[PDB]
Swiss-Prot record, chain A:
Gene transcribed to yield this protein: XXX
Keywords: Capsid protein, Virion
Signal peptide: none
A Pfam family: Tecti-min-caps
Annotated InterPro entries: Tecti-min-caps
Organism: Enterobacteria phage PRD1 (Bacteriophage PRD1)
Nucleotide-binding as UniProt keyword: no
Main location: virion
Protein name: Minor capsid protein P30
GO BP terms, alphabetized: viral capsid assembly
Subcellular location field: Virion
Curated annotation (Swiss-Prot), chain B:
Subcellular localization: Virion
Organism of origin: Enterobacteria phage PRD1
Oligomer and partners: Homotrimer.
Residues in the signal sequence: none
Protein name, UniProt field: Major capsid protein P3
Spans through the membrane: none
Function field: Major capsid protein self-assembles to form an icosahedral capsid with a pseudo T=25 symmetry, about 66 nm in diameter, and consisting of 240 capsid proteins trimers. The capsid encapsulates an inner membrane and the genomic dsDNA genome. The major coat protein P3 and two assembly factors (P10 and P17) are needed during the assembly of the virus particle inside the host cell, when the capsid protein multimers are capable of enclosing the host-derived membrane, containing the virus-encoded membrane-associated proteins.
Amino acid sequence: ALINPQFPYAGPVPIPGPAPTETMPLLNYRVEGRIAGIQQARQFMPFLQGPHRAVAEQTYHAIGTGIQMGQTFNQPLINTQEG
Amino acid sequence: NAGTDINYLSQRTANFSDTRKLDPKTWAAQTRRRIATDFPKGVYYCDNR
């Protein structure tokens, strides 16, 4: 702010002001609020809580069976070298 | 009518104090900033969101 003498800035907005209204009042709000609809315990989703496999491992079962059977052919006898 | 039957529009509070006393075209200008065009003839909008 600058004040300049001799033209000085009025020393106030004075008493000639026009009170325009008495509408100043905010009427307090008084209220009762009830949000009470029956609630049912459940919601349907496509899927909740699953941690789906991105790849599975290979998996398997097992079997064996049979017996011990055989047809054989042997090497001929040979002269013994030494000993 | 497209504003020609109105001197001005405004929103005023209890002291006679207008916060936006505007001629119709200027009022329409504010609306053009909101919906990119004008509402139909005789329809005036005011945003206080």
